[PDB]
Amino acid sequence: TFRRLWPTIAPFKAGLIVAGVALILNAASDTFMLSLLKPLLDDGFGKTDRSVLVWMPLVVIGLMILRGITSYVSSYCISWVSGKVVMTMRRRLFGHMMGMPVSFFDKQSTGTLLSRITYDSEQVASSSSGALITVVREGASIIGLFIMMFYYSWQLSIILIVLAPIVSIAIRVVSKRFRNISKNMQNTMGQVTTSAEQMLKGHKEVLIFGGQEVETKRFDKVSNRMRLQGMKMVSASSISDPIIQLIASLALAFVLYAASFPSVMDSLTAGTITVVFSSMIALMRPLKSLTNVNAQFQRGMAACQTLFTILDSEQEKDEGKRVIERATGDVEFRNVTFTYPGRDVPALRNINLKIPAGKTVALVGRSGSGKSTIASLITRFYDIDEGEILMDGHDLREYTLASLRNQVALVSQNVHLFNDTVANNIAYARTEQYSREQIEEAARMAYAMDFINKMDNGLDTVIGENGVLLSGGQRQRIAIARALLRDSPILILDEATSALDTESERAIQAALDELQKNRTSLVIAHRLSTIEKADEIVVVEDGVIVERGTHNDLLEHRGVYAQLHKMQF
């Protein structure tokens, strides 16, 4: 329950104070409205039909109008706090998952991530701010009606507040006793019903033996017993309320008896006792809310604590400082072992695969297990559990993470296109780095220029949600253009060609040929033509390579590769 985030609201603390000054005014407005009942009876209608009686209708409206202004500015100030606390905190939260690993994204919260955080953070702000709005509005209201109690009918106010604990103990104790009696009646009635069900469970036996009249007689007796038990319980519960109301009326009668003795002469005065009495029930509304402050406050902090766990959750380990502009060296594997978190089976077994510079290496598999994540290690969405990916002679742990992400391109039809413009998406995070004519040329080599030309605005349009939803085949060639513009030494392809468009998928293949014309290339293609031009093929058995060699040699020696080659047709 111990809370930080006071520094977070510190720049907006003035917001909370300008809220609270209005809230105290709201409470005072309610107090003054209740106070106006005194002139509305003393000088209301018994005396002359003029003067004070005519000035209350002028002010009461205004009081409510004033209350309304409070109810506005209060609601304006609290929101002006809460939304800001929603923004920056969430912004700070959003500053975290970018440096956080893909693991907790991986099926722990894929879409329920935001559906959690944005909702429970809203609840955090709402509940904390509502604890603030209630502890002061309801609280200041309580102090207002209490000072009102002590302002009119001092002695009567003492007895009025004295009877409240007596009323409370009376109602609670009598309710507890009658609830205990009702609980006893409940178990007796349960016994009767338990007897009753056994009668009708065996209608088979009753039917074969034909004791229908006996069954009716026994059920009549049992139902009479059930009726009597029902009567007893309703009798007890019905005697419950008149006793509680009796004790309440006795408290009221004692209050009226207070007038009998001169302890309260001139506390009566006018019908001011209404102000005394109404205030008491007017106190009941805020008072009931007060005890819920810890119910709300805790909840908010509890919700915050949940998302607070995300805040201190350890980011990706960053133990790399080496920097590279163009890793001409070969990417490599050596006795490398990595396990998918949550899986005991090795997702990666000891592999000595080498990736020569400017040459292509391919993995093939019907299930896709193993090869679906082997390149991810070069990308380092997961840490190197064991092994040596000595990319350009140094490990990915040795090298700076940001540089590693720079040196690698990852092309796939599963691309998530960004809501920014296509000219910004293509040069995303690099719009200042690269020129517009370079972007256009990259579109030409990716052969997306036709689709951009067919689109109404051209190169500065809208793409996805709040956009046009261009087909995934186009999204692939934008990714290929992206890789071309980055011109990264390492490119990763997956080549899950669901369907081959007429001359457009061939254009995609031509663009990929341009991509692999230079650069180091990694592919897990399921497309036969891609396998044909693969310089070396390493087929994967779930979590390890079964055969290494060229597809022609692996066709000569059937092994496992040729089996998949024949079946995949």
Place this chain on the structure above:
Amino acid sequence: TFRRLWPTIAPFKAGLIVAGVALILNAASDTFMLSLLKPLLDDGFGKTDRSVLVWMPLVVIGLMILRGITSYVSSYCISWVSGKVVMTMRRRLFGHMMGMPVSFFDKQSTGTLLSRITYDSEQVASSSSGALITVVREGASIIGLFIMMFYYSWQLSIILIVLAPIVSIAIRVVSKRFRNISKNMQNTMGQVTTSAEQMLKGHKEVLIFGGQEVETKRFDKVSNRMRLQGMKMVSASSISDPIIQLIASLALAFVLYAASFPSVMDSLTAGTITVVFSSMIALMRPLKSLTNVNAQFQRGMAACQTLFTILDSEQEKDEGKRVIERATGDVEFRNVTFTYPGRDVPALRNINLKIPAGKTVALVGRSGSGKSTIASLITRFYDIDEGEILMDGHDLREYTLASLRNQVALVSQNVHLFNDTVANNIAYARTEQYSREQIEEAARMAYAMDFINKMDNGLDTVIGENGVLLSGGQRQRIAIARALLRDSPILILDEATSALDTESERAIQAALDELQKNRTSLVIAHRLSTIEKADEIVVVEDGVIVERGTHNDLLEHRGVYAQLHKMQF
């Protein structure tokens, strides 16, 4: 929505009318208390002489005694009426339930039937009771307060009742328009959230492209837009409350101002204004309750119809009237086809079993999908779809239902013992017919005497639920005693041996031999010795016979019986 339901209540309409007078007395008590509020403000507190005041606490405490007694008698009589109707309706529907076929009891409602005859029956009674209580009491209170404010003011009541509906239309229209605007801001907030999840889907892409800074800037922009929309939505919702408060305050201000601006009232001498206003406030509650009277009536009456359809459901067909005291004829089967209501596969295919008198037939086979069918056809638990099941030269359809059930016995380990004495259990529906000495002899042959003398009081003690809980084998002994006492010509044995007690199950087979002296029986066999003792054996595939011959003849022709002999070893 239509009910008849009145002859059920007709002998108990006295209860409802006494309840009605009780509830009108309660409402009049509440009205008189709100009336006694008048002298309090008028002369109780303002004037010096409180001798007039001290009269009032006596009147209010006495009125509360009166109200408590009225509530008590109200609850007593309404509970009387409810318990009587649920009692008589449960008895009637149970009488119909005896006549219901087993198909209704064949899992159509096995635990939900208990729900029907207890929970929804009580809901029927309680809902009708609450509907009547609500209409008479709240309506009477409404008329009481109406005449009360008309009494203390011809015109103040009129003005209040005319500005009430204007308050209603004002609050309704402002709430409707503001709710529509709130929904508009809601869908805009939904749009920006759509942008939010689309923004955070591709964290994988963001990481490989390293656009964390631009990602942070863009999320800052969308978060700012979301905060602005939140500010707009909360401002719009907040601006509601001062508007309704303003219109309500204008209504109150108009009340006071018009009532005191000229002399159109001329009669508001005292806190009678407080009386009328408090009575309107206390009128708001029963007015709200009256709206739900139709809802409660409809709920309870739908429950009534739910139980009604159970009540007026077609009983077992009873078009058989032939009678017999003791059928020596050979009960036989002739091309009889029968299916359970359910799966279309025939539970019984056209078959021609013959059961000679005196001789015992044994239905054999594991089956599991029809073993208990042929037992069930004897007792007409389900109607015969086709062919002739002939009982002494007359079909089961021809013979009287009660007579046929008399002529047949059904012994099984799975048997419902009645919650009555052991002497009553043995002679259930036969107490007057047989003698206790005969019961003792039947106990001797059943060999439960060793366990009946064990029991403390003897043959006249509770055995079932809320009883000794005698074990299942002991229930089988009492069942065989019942079979002996009935001495019916036909008897069915289920004979799920499960385990064989030492010298007690042997005595159970001795009792079975006492049965097998005569009284032809079709026995379901899981007992090799009883299989050997069978005069004739007939196997069942599931819907039709596999073979029909003695177990030695089925050792000659193996068929299916030898496969059972494999598991009997």
